[PDB]
């Protein structure tokens, strides 16, 4: 009955590491925005003080250390991995590719459109939504890998 279970396990192990890395990075971005906004003792979680428009822009778009472009390339890598692992459900891949879009607005980068002049609370919720979309994508790929 089982022959290429090695395919299932190997492909599913690659996906998990990539999904976990991306979510860990997003958790760091949420914490960096919270810490920039408030202080070193800042709690990422709900009902947080000092909403600021500058924290997300500093953390994501700073010219020396900005993480926006890094985040974009990491989501792209993950979305491309999801595409190679999926079956032939365009309609399902088309759903996840839409959740993981990297498209901005006009002559601006995806990172600029999303984090230019954006409140800390809105930036953290946007990042939380991105993690939940990564986790949804992961679950759908896993189901597809089992056949």
């Amino acid at each position, epitope marked *: 009955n089982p022959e290429k279970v090695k395919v299932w396990y190997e492909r599913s192990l690659v996906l998990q590491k990539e999904a976990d890395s991306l979510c860990t990075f997003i*958790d760091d971005l949420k914490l960096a925005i919270a810490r920039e906004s408030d202080g070193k003792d800042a709690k990422v979680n709900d009902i947080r003080r000092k909403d600021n428009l500058d924290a997300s822009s500093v953390v994501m778009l700073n010219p020396i250390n900005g993480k926006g472009s890094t985040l974009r390339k990491e989501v792209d890598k993950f979305r491309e991995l999801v595409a190679t692992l999926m079956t032939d459900k365009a309609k399902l891949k088309l759903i996840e590719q839409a959740l993981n879009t990297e498209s901005g607005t006009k002559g601006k980068s995806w990172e600029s459109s999303l984090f230019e002049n954006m409140p800390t609370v809105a930036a953290i919720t946007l990042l939380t939504k991105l993690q939940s979309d990564v986790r949804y994508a992961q679950g759908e790929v896993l189901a597809d890998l089992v056949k």
Partner: nanobody, 125 residues
Framework: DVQLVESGGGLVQAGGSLRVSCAAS????????MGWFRQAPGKEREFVAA????????YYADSVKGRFTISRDSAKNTVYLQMNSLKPEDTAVYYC???????????????????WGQGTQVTVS
């Protein structure tokens, strides 16, 4: 507040090996990644190696890559930096640090490390 204790520094000749440890307190290992930084004579401190708590991934400076190994023991709340093929350039003050971050994009950044230890002077001759 978090507290780190350091022990294992020594004097060794070229091509020799050593092992430095760092003591951790409480559940800090679960919430914080552990990093190790060395400060060369008359120079600014630089990152050596880091241990991620999230993925338990290891990160190394390209100058110490292949010679140095970072380890984690959850029960002992201790981190080990195994230093092999030691060169005189490795002579420095080795410092302990904890960061709330867990990804590769933050673990190499000295500024992202909240807590520090005194360290031990390691000499290679």
């Amino acid at each position: 507040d978090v507290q780190l204790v350091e022990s294992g520094g020594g004097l060794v000749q070229a091509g020799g090996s050593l092992r430095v440890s760092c003591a951790a307190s409480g559940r800090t290992f679960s919430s914080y990644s552990m990093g190790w930084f060395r400060q060369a004579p008359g120079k600014e401190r630089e990152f050596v190696a880091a241990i991620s708590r999230s993925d338990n991934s290891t990160y190394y400076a390209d100058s110490v890559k292949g010679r140095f190994t970072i380890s984690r023991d959850s029960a002992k709340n201790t981190v080990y930096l195994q230093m092999n093929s030691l060169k005189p350039e490795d002579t420095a003050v080795y410092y302990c640090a904890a960061t709330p971050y867990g990804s590769r994009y933050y673990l190499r950044e000295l500024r992202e490390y909240d807590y520090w230890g005194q360290g031990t002077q390691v000499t290679v001759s």
